[PDB]
Amino acid sequence: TYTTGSFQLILGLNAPQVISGEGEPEGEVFASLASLEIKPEAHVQELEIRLDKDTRYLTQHTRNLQPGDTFHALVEPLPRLRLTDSGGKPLAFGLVELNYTCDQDICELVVHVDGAVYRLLVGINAPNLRESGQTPVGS
């Protein structure tokens, strides 16, 4: 099978002490992330939600977002929609559609939908949620 986890990578150029695994950063950089040269991979997910008489408020938690990422959400059956962080400090409000961009090193987001059955569509790095086309992709 394959394996999963986090890793630390040390690269050196004409620095024979790197193979010992203890090389401290020095000099001027020479390599960079390759993925930054192109567009990021989008993730799209769709959910059907229902607001019963006693369950008019619903919340969902998102995975972590890296800096520079973007978040999009829309709802089509109108209830109110808003976005807050894990503490709860508001970040964006629905106009229903919503948009946000990540500034902090790690962003943890919570989607609020409050008011019947509605369709909720959500995406990361996917501004094309209006006309996705593809079946839900990514994680």
């Binding site: 408020y57 919340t59 894990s86 709860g88 400090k89 508001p90 409000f93 919570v110 409050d114």
Partner: protein
Amino acid sequence: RVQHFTGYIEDGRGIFYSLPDMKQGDIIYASMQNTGGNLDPLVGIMAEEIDPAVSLGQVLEKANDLISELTAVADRIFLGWDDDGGKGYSASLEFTIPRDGTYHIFAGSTITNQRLDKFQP
């Protein structure tokens, strides 16, 4: 030139600090950190001392219903401000002194939500 201050905030009642006779070309720096409780720091700088309570209260009364309204009101009340520029929810501010004169520094609490079951600023 560095100075320290300590205080207490109760139910969004801020504290004013006076900066007598600054000179044009000076650079002001500010940083505010939480040392107890659930305080969320906010810092702003202005020339004429006016209590922001009356203006900020209308933002709570209108409960981008929060962030845009707070930004629009702050950009009117203060010449410069910062909410979360530091480590965590702490604020940090750099402000170049426009002209010659005196100014005021305002320290207090921002409007935030701290719940996941319901929204209540």
